[PDB]
């Protein structure tokens, strides 16, 4: 097999232009490695961005174009967006399949919307009490989540997720706050508190 | 408007085979190529085998020539990608794509499945309250929990709701996994409309639905 390469990583900014090489291990690429350029998105999310080497496909930003520089194939992104944050990968042909590049990933401010959901009857009735606070609308994507009891801190039974960028190009994450049917009447209230970016945000939900 | 959708998570035992199937919609079926790359646990994309559906021309690669068979059927736009005798080794996400030549290809793609070489789900409907239902928009949620292993494919209205659908990223509780789902809809829709989360474990033959009541 023919090993092709890229770069690791790119932090990039708005409106500059970005240059993506392809350096193949079997030597000068040229246009029988028909370069083809693939976009990746979270969740295996692919999409054609250039092909034959230089061929933009349906649907792409004129900002993209591929060219043969050198010995290499590249991808330039003339006029850089939020959304053009993703994994690039290049593709060369090698006779009868396609050899792809582990990717080049290239990187490119919200408050979080806090939704809290109390225990549902069923789980109750199993003497379990789960307290869901769902995290929505933020970036940059790093949130501390803290859970009160009646005001008071909470540390044990508490499960919270990793960000996960969403397609509108903003984090989401979950809390769970894992209870027993007596604790979860025995008290107050329940607050999901939030700290992003300096702010805090908290709700509450009461068992009465 | 075109589309290639694929089928659903696949588990199995190591030694046996699966049948993946990639389904496609706004063009010449037959006059068209089908690819299908393959993406391991974190190792870059793969080329397994293509094969051009009006002329049954399935052309493969040194290593999968042996345990990928690929079929056709024109007669319903789908195309099967079969592997035999599985390893730990074939554990990854199956995508596919099509092409025309290669100067124009791999453009469109599918979202891709994920085959994994068991516990089912308990669904619980998650009622708004005062923190969820919240004027003009009143959002449902639903919670899968303590199943395995992943994925659980959830759903609301089997599909219709497709806006405002928002599934978190599960959590690992030892060895299993919980997640949540939520919907948001306008607060004249719900309880007025029907509103049921469809969860889906394929590795447990496990499907529920779950109407989401006040
Ligand atoms: C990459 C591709 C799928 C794989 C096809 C293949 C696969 C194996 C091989 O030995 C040769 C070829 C080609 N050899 O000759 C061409 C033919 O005779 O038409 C055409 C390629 C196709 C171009 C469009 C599609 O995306």
């Known amino acids: 097999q023919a090993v092709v390469t890229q770069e690791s990583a790119l932090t990039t900014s708005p409106g500059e232009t970005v240059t993506l090489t392809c350096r193949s291990s079997?030597?000068?690429?040229?246009?029988?490695?028909?370069a083809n350029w693939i976009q990746e998105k979270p969740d295996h999310l692919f999409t054609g961005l250039i092909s034959?080497?230089?061929n933009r496909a349906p649907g792409v930003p004129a900002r993209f174009s591929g060219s043969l520089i050198g010995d290499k194939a590249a991808l330039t992104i003339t006029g850089a967006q939020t959304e053009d944050e993703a994994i690039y990968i290049c593709?060369?042909?090698?006779?009868?399949?396609?050899?792809f590049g582990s990717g080049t990933k290239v990187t490119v401010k919200s408050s979080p919307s806090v939704t809290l959901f109390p225990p549902s009857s069923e789980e109750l009735e199993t003497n379990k009490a789960t307290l869901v606070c769902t995290i929505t609308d933020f970036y940059p994507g790093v949130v501390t989540v803290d859970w009160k009891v009646d005001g008071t801190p909470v540390t044990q039974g508490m499960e919270t997720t990793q960000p996960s960028k969403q397609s509108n190009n903003k984090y989401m994450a979950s809390s769970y706050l894992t209870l027993t049917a007596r604790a979860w009447e025995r008290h107050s209230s329940y607050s999901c508190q939030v700290t992003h970016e300096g702010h805090t945000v908290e709700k509450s939900l009461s068992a009465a | 408007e075109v589309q290639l959708q694929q089928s659903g998570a696949e588990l199995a035992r190591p030694g046996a085979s699966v049948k993946l199937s990639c389904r496609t919609s706004?063009?010449?079926?037959?006059?068209?190529?089908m690819q299908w790359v393959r993406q391991r646990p974190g190792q870059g994309l793969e080329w397994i085998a293509a094969?051009?559906?009006?002329?049954?021309?399935?052309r493969y690669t040194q290593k999968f020539k042996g345990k990928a068979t690929l079929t056709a059927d024109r007669s319903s736009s789908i195309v099967y990608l079969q592997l035999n005798s599985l390893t730990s080794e074939d554990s990854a996400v199956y995508s596919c794509?099509?092409?025309?030549?290669?100067?124009?290809?791999?453009?469109?793609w599918g979202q891709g499945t994920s085959v994994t070489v068991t516990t089912p789900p308990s669904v619980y409907p998650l009622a708004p309250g005062s923190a969820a239902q919240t004027n003009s928009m009143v959002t449902l949620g639903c919670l899968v929990k303590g199943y395995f292993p992943e994925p659980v494919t959830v759903s609301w209205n089997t599909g219709s709701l497709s806006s405002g659908v928002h599934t978190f990223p599960a959590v690992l509780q030892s060895d299993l996994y919980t997640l949540s789902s939520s919907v948001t809809v306008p607060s004249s829709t719900w309880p007025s409309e029907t509103v049921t989360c469809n969860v889906a474990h394929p590795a447990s033959s496990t499907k529920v639905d779950k109407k989401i009541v006040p």
């Open positions: 706004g063009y010449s079926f037959t006059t068209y190529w």
């Open positions: 034959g080497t230089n």
């Open positions: 794509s099509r092409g025309r030549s290669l100067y124009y290809t791999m453009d469109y």
């Open positions: 593709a060369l042909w090698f006779s009868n399949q396609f050899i």
């Open positions: 094969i051009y559906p009006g002329d049954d021309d399935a």
């Open positions: 079997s030597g000068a690429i040229t246009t029988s490695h028909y």
